[PDB]
Design a protein around this ligand. Structure first.
Ligand SMILES: [Cl-]
Ligand SMILES: [Cl-]
Ligand SMILES: [Cl-]
Ligand SMILES: [Cl-]
Lengths: 215, 215, 215, 215
């Protein structure tokens, strides 16, 4: 089965955990996958591991600062330059707090918001600019548990519902995934399998909503 | 692809619309499908149409009164008798009101509750009795738009969340589907494709929640 | 303070618990209160207790079968006959299951649905017929925890949202209350205080939604 | 009636709209009110207008940068210094986007997040440090419509639910308000009346949830 056959796909946070599991599952299902990661070194490690699994598959990797819309746009532009289009944007990157509320620093809080909310907005915005005249595309936003208490989780859910209803006219689907607690309990593959379904044409009826995955 | 290969499946309201579309899609994906319908004549018409499409496929059909837990249990028992087990219960049957609130009769309202809430509870309860010692199973509850204003929709959603968390221990998944407006606009296949994903092992991480399908 | 001064109010399930606490609080706040209860004997006991607290207050009591829309309409008609109008309908009556899901009888389940969903619909429908030409009124629906696991809770929430948006044009507010676990932990007064606020003109901006009171 | 008698209250964004309406209503109901605003000049204008209405009432005003947790903490510290305590924190300040999604600038988006999410977190965190040993307090978070499409709205809702459940042990209530479209349609007083109820002891049963005020 090849549920995402020939779908040009970007996976943010694609060097570890759910993201990396999604990269494998998407390659298995016929996608043309590119990963974004935190640093180019982490990206290159993940690309080497993917090459161990899929020696014949081309996989691009980039490390834009997700908090910079310009950097995200440049990296999206390179993917579109290679393949001519972007079919699926998976805003999967997210972080968790070290601390509970009473002890979280202003700097940690803003950093969580920066990755979990601004990063997802940036990925969605950039993917939209790329897909808006194609009358086809899927943007999947991951609403990860904040660690603090969630706040960032609910923001991505709101982002997903609002954006989905606003651009429904353009035939771009926008869908969320709210995972529970994952193993480095859900396995990462169990979340990635949901990405897979949502990216596929089997989910053509699903937009402007978020799927809870708990299990 | 055979996302529900060898899954013994019952689809309520399986003679028309979403239900019938699900019957076809499930047969295509390797399931052993049985349909329940409103009357045995409607069931036999649907079975004849399925035989036109799949001349070699065995498909059982029954017409238990969904408001009678005993009748539902008997029909579930016949399926388990044929196949030795029940893997997937799809409580898809639902009805819509003729009238808006101010004009709906007490009799129409109770009838909607009877099919849309009691019928789904009966199907879920009966499927649970059948699956409870198997440590495997999926119950999918459809929360259809009431027509009145939903009420029945939200009841099935609550039923799905409560039941799912209660029997999570038994490794039975319980999931809901809340479809939007369907064409006799979403096509029925677009809803049935969600049933398919949720019945499959790709949805192993999904339980005690409802997926909105609007689109 | 007299937050519901001269508001003609009906409280279903008004002989015990939250309902009875609401009767007292509403009388204290200047309402003209009538209670509905399960039987006329229970009603008369509650009326005697209210007279102990408020010797000068008139309080009517009725015991319509909440599952019979005709009986509810007759009892609403008597209140409107006494006072000329109905300002506030509080569909507070609800029951809980003895049993968990696997052991609940078909008869217990239908009885819970009958009181918790049909009864609330009947109260809302009857109050609407009474209030629809007044361009003023509040219907408060209580969505109580099913006891089973939810189902009835979510149905009343859906009922409240749908009905509220449908009759917003008529300047009738429809609002829900979803209480947590109450003491015969929340005290009953803590729920009744929310009824009070929602019935008052301070809640004029609140309709087609449900307030959770947990905690 | 004096629903918040002697409650030391801070209202962010208290110089206009809902905030200013809340200042008046809270003063009327016996609170000791302090307002935070965008600039000290806007604050002084609002204080002059409040003095026109309440010549004998003391009202403090501050203009901390809500995006700076240190500045918010200093201003909360001045209020606690004047009155010895903080009873009610109302994180009411919020902004709306000029632009829809496709045209919103990275700078506008971050600014909205900064006020609508970081500002509310800062206010809540600072109020918590102040109230945590008092075993009494209310934090009200306003989840305002983003303007963009939601995102900030859902983040405050998540913040409110998570924080409320985390500090329920401390007898500090945390509650949200999600207003609809307001007149400079709901009037600002209709939202402020909800703040009033939620700050009062009538809402003692309400925490870790958000009230929608639409309507
Ligand atoms: Cl390969
Ligand atoms: Cl065949
Ligand atoms: Cl008296
Ligand atoms: Cl004064």
């Amino acid at each position: 089965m090849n549920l995402v056959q020939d779908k040009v796909t970007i996976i943010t946070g694609g060097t570890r955990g759910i993201g990396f599991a999604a990269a494998k599952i998407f390659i298995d299902n016929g996608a043309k996958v590119s990963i974004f990661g935190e640093t180019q070194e982490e990206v290159d490690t993940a690309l080497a591991q993917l090459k161990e699994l899929y020696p014949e598959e081309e996989v691009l990797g980039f490390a834009p600062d997700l908090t910079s819309r310009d950097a995200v746009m440049a990296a999206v532009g390179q993917v579109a330059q290679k393949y001519g289009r972007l079919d699926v944007m998976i805003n999967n990157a997210g972080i968790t707090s070290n601390n509970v509320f009473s002890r979280v620093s202003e700097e940690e809080f803003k950093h969580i918001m920066d990755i979990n909310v601004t990063g997802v907005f940036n990925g969605a915005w950039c993917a939209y600019q790329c897909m808006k005249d194609a009358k086809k595309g899927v943007i999947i936003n991951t609403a990860s548990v904040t660690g603090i208490f969630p706040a960032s989780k609910a923001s991505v859910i709101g982002l997903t519902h609002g954006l989905g209803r606003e651009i429904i006219r353009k035939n771009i689907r926008v869908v969320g995934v709210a995972p529970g607690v994952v193993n480095t309990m859900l396995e990462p593959e169990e979340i990635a399998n949901v990405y897979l379904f949502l990216a596929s044409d089997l989910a053509s009826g699903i937009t402007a909503t978020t799927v809870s995955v708990d299990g």
